[PDB]
Every structure is written in C-alpha cells, then in structure tokens.
Amino acid sequence: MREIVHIQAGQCGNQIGAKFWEVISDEHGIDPTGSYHGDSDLQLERINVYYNEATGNKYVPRAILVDLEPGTMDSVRSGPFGQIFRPDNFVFGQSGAGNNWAKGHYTEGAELVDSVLDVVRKESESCDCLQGFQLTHSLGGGTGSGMGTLLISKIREEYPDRIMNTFSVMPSPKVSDTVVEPYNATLSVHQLVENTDETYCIDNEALYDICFRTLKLTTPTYGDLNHLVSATMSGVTTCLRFPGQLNADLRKLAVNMVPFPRLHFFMPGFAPLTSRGSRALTVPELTQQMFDSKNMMAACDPRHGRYLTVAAIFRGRMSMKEVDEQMLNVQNKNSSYFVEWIPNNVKTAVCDIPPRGLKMSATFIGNSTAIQELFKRISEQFTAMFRRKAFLHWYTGEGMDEMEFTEAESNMNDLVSEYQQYQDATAD
C-alpha cells in the first residue's frame, strides 16, 4: 500500500483539487515547475504516495483532471500550480453536463469515461503497490456528481480490491449554482453508499456558516469556502504523506473508522478556523475547538448523535503529554457522545510539521451518527421537488425512470435509519 491515484471531476472537483495540490506541494517543498526546493528530508520520505518522479528529479502529481466542459481545464492550467500537472492527464469533453446528473452518468459522461479509465490505467500500472483512489467532486452538479459516480463504479469493477476514498462536496441553498442540486445529490449519495470505502462529507452549508458566523465574512466567495476545504484536506491526509507515529494507509484507516460498511461518511473538523488573510493557540484550546459543532465541516451537531469512531490529528511542535491528557479529558467529560460498545474509539496522531501559516493545528475526522442530519436535509429538499415532479423531464429525457429516483431516495432514508439504529444501540 504505497501510491494513491487522485482524480478531480467537474468544476468544484477541479477547483478544490487544484487548491489541494497547491497546499501539499508547498508542504512537500515542490514549486510550480515540479522541483524540490525544501530543506527537510521528511518532506521527501513519503512523497511517492502522491507524486511520480520524472526526468531531472522532477515531481509530478499522480492526478487526473476530468471535466465535460473545457473551461475549467483551462482555468486550472493557468492557475498557480497549473504547469505541474501531466499534460496527458487532462481529459475533457466539449459539451458540458448542464448541471444534470443523468447527463454526467448516462449520456455525455458515458462517452468520455473510457478515455478517463485509460489514463487511470496508465497511472495505476506505473505504481509499485497502488493503495487506492481519491476523488474530489461535488454532488450538486452534473459532471462531478454524475460522471464522478460513474467513474467510481467503473474503477470498482477494474480494481475491486483497492480502496475508494472521496472528498464529496454537499450542496446548500446558501451557496448554490443550480435548482436541481437535491436531485443530483440524492442520486450521488445512492452511489457513494454502495461503492466508496470512505467519504469525507464537505458541506457547503457548514463552510458558508463558518465564513458568515465565525469568520464574519458578510459575503463569502468560493475562494473563502475552499480555503477551509484545503486546510481540511491537508490535515486529513497528513498521516499518509508524512513519516513517524504509524505507517498510515487508506485500508488501515477504513478498518479502524468503519464498523459497518455503509456507515463510511465522515464529518471532518478543523482548528483553528481562519480567513484567507488572517495568535498562538494552546493544546486545551485546540482540543476543545476541534470537537465544537462550530468547527465541523458537515452541518450537523455532534451533540445530537454519538461518535462510533474518531481520528484526531495534531500538527506542530507540542507536548504529547498535554495532547494525551486533553483527549482523555474530552472523552471522560463527554462520555455520552461516544458509543460505549467500541472500546478506545478515539485515536490521536501528532505530526511535527505544521501547515502553512499556523504554528499549531488539529484536524478532526469523526464517524458520527449525527451525520444523518445532513442526509435528512438533502432528503427534505429532494421530496419538496419530487412530490411535484419539478424539473424531472430533464432526467427522464436522458432515459432515466422515475423509479430510479424513488430507489435513490429510499436508500438514503435507509442510510439515515441505520445511523439512528446505532445512535440508540446501548451496551448489554
């Protein structure tokens, strides 16, 4: 379990995906040309997990950039680290998906998918020991949601033994691009519940609320939201990218975080929360903030459910004794929010290398039953439209059946009742 293959699909997927590569390239000492100009050997120790080594000791992201519209591909290429990507790894169509899941999954996306699988296959075959895939995409549009979930199912068929990890952006009316977002999201969640091993739920509702309420930004842009996403993505993958503590891989993470196969949707959290242009922060403050509902990247109150499992990762030079004491304090004082039938279900990791700008940080990864609130929110929006068959002709026009909507809604309602089941389950 060494190399991960990254895929970014659609506008959102490519925008957050490019930000991810800019952030971790900075952390690993890689400049926009692909040259290493860092000072620590710890930066290069596990750089093979995300980068391929090329002529002249160059480091090339093992990233595949996908879109049914050429516009975003051009904007990534012109972006800060746009020149770092392998030019052959840009796979794009000419006729978009018109924010339609059916177009991305069944029609326009199905015409492009084999070209993407050819580039996935080329990357995968050059891996000494591929551990799995990591997809960044939104669930509210057509390409990232429709074509992204089509790619997941095709990848599962070709690599059934590899881990499929996603960073899935959930839609919100507070920052919306299209009217049909609830349809696209429900159809996608239906796919993720069956075909992914671990999914990070990045809620635009939560990101907007953090920007508006906490960061006091009257009008948040996608750049403000994406700053929180990139910080979370950097934190959540620290264990994979950096040496020390534990040789972390995607499968070990999944086996320790996922007690039941369908319950693999994680509530990410971050501390401290900062603006694009934003102290000191202590260990007790980092620990308290990281477990606060206001620091969650999914719009769910963790105090409304229970944690099945938790992974907390601290970054920066700090007292390991203090981290251990604060983590124990939290569990002992908030015992009713942790499932008693999974002993030692809160794991902590500490990395010496802090992220850019911060001298101390803490990333939270929670498998909480409260995530059912996110799915219920999408479900309420879905049925408000579906009861009136609003905009349905755009999906049935592509060959879909009304029954396929009924099935996707049913499976999401089942996922919610399964979370409720373990929220009520006590020790016996």
Binding site: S95, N100, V179, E181
Partner: protein, 434 residues
C-alpha cells in the same frame, strides 16, 4: 463545437435579426464584409469561417414576400450573408396563419429545410436553434409553426428556443393577430423548449419613458430588443467568469415542458442624451424586480417565481452579485413556489454592453438581464385569449382560415390548449399538500 443556428421568420423576425447581427458584429469586431481585423474563440458558436477569413452568421432569413429581405440584400450588411441564407417567396401570407402554414408555406418549406441542413452539416456539436418571429403575422405565425414541426422531425429533441413578438395596438397590429397568436402557440407548444415573448407594448413604453422617444419606430424597438437578445446569447458567444450554455439555461428555467415562457427584465436602460453616476450591481439587480423594465406587461409581484436566472455583463464580480442576491432572498414580497428550494442561476460575462453609433441607449459599465419563470406571465395569455374569444364567439374572420383548408375544430382545439395552459400556470403556483 457548441454551435447555435438562428432562424429569422417574417418581417418582425427578419428586422429583429438585422438588429441582432449588427450588434453581434460590433461586439466581436466583425466588419460588414465579414472580415475580422485581428484571443476569445467563442464567437464561432454564431459565426462560421471561410478560407479567406470571412466570418459568416450561422443564420437563415426567411420571408414569404421579398421586400424586407431585399433591404438586407442591398443594405450595409449585404456582404455578411451568402445569398442562399436569405430566402424569399413572391406572395406573403396576408396576415393569415393558414396561408403561412399551408397554402403558401408548403411551397417553400423544403428549400428552407435544405438550407438549414447545410448549416447543421457545418456543425460538430449543434446546441440547437434560436427562432425569431412575430405572433401576429401570417408568416411569423403560420410558417414558423410549420418549420417548428419539421425541425422536430429532422432534428428530434434538439433544443429549439423562440424569441416571439407579442402583439400590441400601439405598434402596428392587424385585426386577426389574436387568431394567429393562439394558433401558432398551440401548434408550436410541444416543439419549443423555451420561448422568450417580447410584448411590443412593453418595448414601446420603455422607449417612451426611459429613452424619451415620443413616437418609437421599429428601429427604436428592435435596437432595444437586440440588447436583451444579446444579453441572453452573450453566454454562448463569449468566455466569461461564470458561463451558461443553452442546455443549462433550460434546465434552470423550465420546470415542466409546457411551462417554458420566461419573463425577461433588463437594466439599465438609460438615454444617450441623459447627462450621472454609474449604477452598482445591487442597483441594477434590484431594478430586475421593478415592472417598468419588463419585456412583457404583467405583475410578478402578485404571482410566484419558479426560477430566476441573472445574466450579468461588464464590470461585475461574483462577490457583489452574491451580496445583491442575498438581499433579494430576504424580500418577503418576492415569493417562490414551495417546491423550489433554490431558484437562482448566475452568469457573468466580461464584455460590457455595446452601443450602436446613432443609437438611443447610453454606454454603461455593467448591465443585467433577468430571466424569471413567473406564474404572472399567464396574464399575457389571458389578454390574448380574451381578444380571441370576442371575435370567435361570432366566428368573425374564421372564413379566411377555413377557405385555406383549415377546420373550425382547429380553432377550438387551439383555444382549449390555451385554456389548459392558463390552468397549468394556476396549478403550478398552488402550495403542495402536507
């Protein structure tokens, strides 16, 4: 890739086409001879290129009489079009839908389809058709509906969008226009995916009130209409910050196939003589909800919104647009149907509105065109249906249509479809159960 074919039918369609293509040329720096002294490649959606660098509109002009198209053939832009794109007959439909659709139309329909096929066969990814026509003319009503039916056979579900001129007494109407209007609406309904009605009374009032024109001419009306048509199509002809393709327009505006008639509102409309601070994004966006700037006379304040698409052009950044939409989202007086959780679609284009020299509009830094699907547009159907009913109750003028091979059953069948359409707009606005 992503090509759009424009089809201009009858006098109104042709004359509005002249204003649109003049404006497009000016916006893209294309000379009347097709040469483009020279980047942004997107203009190729509307213009093909010859080996000798000439840029030719992907357009067809059709009329059953030659005098309107003859002015194009001898005018400033005569060199822009290839003769085969400008199609004329010898005798018009005489303001009779039946002559445009059957008697006269049948004689030229195959030739028109052949020329459209020739343009389609130069496309590698045709997005659809944009059809310009009046409701009241015999050609605008009759020939258009015949063409629309034939396009559905030759191009299946390929998108067909309309720009339809809705009749007004102030702007040269004929007695039978309400008949032609209901007949064309009935026959075109299942073949059209989206239709932008332009009420001649609304344009006339905007010219009088905002441009200080005492008695507006068709040139005054068409130049204003072209500015709105350009705002709708700019998303296809330019690469902006936030783009909206043809399929995206329809997905975000049309909740049900029959409910496909958005209301257009444009701002700002300022006189060239008006001597004057520049309007903010919030100011021009707020103006979209004021009735004075609507393209159809109706009252959205007393209806319900189903969708809202804001098309900005010029000096505009997303942050300012989002702040303007946030204030609109907290306006109790603007009501959306309960089945629409998020009704906005935004598009932003870098290129500000273009001023035709000798035109009536002032040069602005930023402008916006809102396309809203409101239940209030059914007022426009109601007014036309009432005029139809006044005459039809006496069978006045129906003999002219029956004489051309039509049956009285078609009149009542067209009218029953309009009654169902009014009822569909009523049902779509009612609250959902539980």
């Amino acid at each position: 890739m992503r090509e759009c074919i424009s089809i201009h039918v009858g006098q109104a369609g042709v004359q509005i086409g002249n204003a649109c293509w003049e404006l497009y040329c000016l916006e893209h720096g294309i000379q009347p001879d097709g040469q483009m002294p020279s980047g942004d490649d997107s203009f190729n959606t509307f213009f093909s290129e010859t080996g000798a660098g000439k840029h030719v509109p992907r357009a067809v002009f059709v009329d059953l009489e030659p005098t309107v198209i003859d002015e194009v053939r001898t005018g400033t832009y005569r060199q822009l079009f290839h003769p085969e794109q400008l199609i004329t007959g010898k005798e018009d439909a005489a303001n009779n839908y039946a002559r445009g659709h059957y008697t006269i139309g049948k004689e030229i329909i195959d030739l028109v389809l052949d020329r459209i096929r020739k343009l389609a066969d130069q496309c590698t990814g045709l997005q659809g058709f944009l059809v310009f026509h009046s409701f009241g003319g015999g050609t605008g009503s009759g020939f258009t509906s015949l063409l629309m039916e034939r396009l559905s056979v030759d191009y299946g579900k390929k998108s067909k969008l309309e720009f339809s001129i809705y009749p007004a007494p102030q702007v040269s109407t004929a007695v039978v226009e309400p008949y032609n209007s209901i007949l064309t609406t009935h026959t075109t309904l299942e073949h059209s995916d989206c239709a932008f009605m332009v009420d001649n009374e609304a344009i006339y009032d905007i010219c009088r009130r905002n441009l200080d024109i005492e008695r507006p001419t068709y040139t005054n009306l068409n130049r204003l209409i072209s500015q709105i048509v350009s705002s709708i199509t700019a998303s296809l002809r330019f690469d902006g910050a936030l783009n909206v393709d043809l399929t995206e327009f329809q997905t975000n505006l049309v909740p049900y196939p029959r409910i496909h008639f958005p209301l257009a509102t444009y701002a700002p409309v300022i006189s060239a003589e008006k001597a004057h601070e520049q309007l903010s994004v919030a100011e021009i966006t707020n103006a979209c909800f004021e009735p004075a700037n609507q393209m159809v006379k109706c009252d959205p304040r007393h209806g319900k919104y189903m969708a809202c698409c804001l098309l900005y052009r010029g000096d505009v950044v997303p942050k300012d647009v989002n702040a303007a939409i946030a204030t609109i989202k907290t306006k109790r007086s603007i009501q959306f149907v309960d089945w629409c959780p998020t009704g906005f679609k935004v598009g932003i284009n870098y290129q500000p509105p273009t001023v035709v020299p000798g035109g009536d509009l002032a040069k602005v830094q930023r402008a916006v065109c809102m396309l809203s699907n409101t239940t209030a547009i059914a007022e426009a159907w109601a007014r036309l249906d009432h005029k139809f009913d006044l005459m039809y109750a006496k069978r006045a003028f129906v003999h002219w249509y029956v004489g051309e091979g039509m049956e009285e059953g078609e009149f009542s069948e067209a009218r029953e479809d309009m009654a169902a359409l009014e009822k569909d707009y009523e049902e779509v606005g009612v609250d959902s159960v539980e």
